[PDB]
Amino acid sequence: QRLEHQVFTWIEQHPKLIFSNERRQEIARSIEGLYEENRYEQVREKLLA
């Protein structure tokens, strides 16, 4: 959870980026299911997307 906070502080640090709400929910969900559903690679893969 703290890492999630850091992730969305990394997001919230780039205001020039218009991360819609939907992509933010996607990221939230991808974090919520770490190592039970998807490893981190799918998370940072979408961030990089």
């Binding site: 969900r29 919520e32 299911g33 039970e36 559903e37």
Partner: protein
């Protein structure tokens, strides 16, 4: 002091005991070779702290002669035990229906603006008479009936439009007039009205 004298009396008259009973029960627990048997025995000793039952939604047919497998069972939707749908501990967001709330206020205020325009159409230099409007809108008929009620119930002759425009009533009672609208007709005495400066 009084408590102490009372204690002397109780000391004279009191005293019981049950300890040894515990020991036989403890020995029996020694004989309890499995914890379910032990739970049963403990329940003998004391009873259940609570009770077990199942929740349901509604009553069912009372066919004594039929069993559940014949019955259609109580099919349940199971919130998946995976976040793969949504498995939640932290709070959810409020829907943020600001669009819908704004639309509702807009529509309500627009209906009331239509009503206000209608009242304005009927404000003849700040005066209205019921007989002059023998043909009326349903809304204006109900408004004027409310005006009659407000003025006659309140001997002050005061009357209120929902917009804050006050109204004081002039009165006269020897008449029979008819009022026509979309729904029905009504036969009534007449009344007169004027508007005040609470605008």
């Amino acid at each position: 002091m009084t408590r102490y004298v009372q204690r002397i009396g109780e000391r004279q008259q009191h005293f019981r005991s049950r300890k040894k009973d515990y020991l036989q029960l403890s020995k029996w627990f020694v004989e309890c070779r499995d914890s379910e048997e032990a739970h049963k025995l403990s329940a003998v000793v004391f009873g259940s702290m609570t009770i077990q039952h199942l929740q349901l939604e509604e009553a069912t047919t009372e066919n004594l002669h039929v069993d559940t497998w014949d019955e259609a069972p109580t099919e349940l939707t199971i919130k998946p035990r995976t976040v793969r749908y949504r498995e939640k501990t932290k709070p959810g967001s409020f829907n943020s229906n600001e669009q819908k709330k704004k639309e509702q206020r807009e529509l309500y205020l627009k209906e009331r603006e239509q009503e206000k325009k209608l009242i304005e159409k009927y404000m003849t230099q700040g005066k209205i008479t019921l007989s002059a409007l023998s043909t009326v809108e349903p809304f204006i008929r109900k408004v004027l009936l409310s005006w009659i009620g407000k003025s006659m119930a309140a001997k002050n002759r005061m009357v209120k439009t929902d917009y804050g425009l006050h109204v004081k009533v002039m009165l006269d009672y020897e008449k029979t007039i008819t009022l026509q609208a979309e729904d029905g007709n009504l036969l009534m005495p007449d009344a007169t009205f004027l508007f005040e400066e609470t605008r």
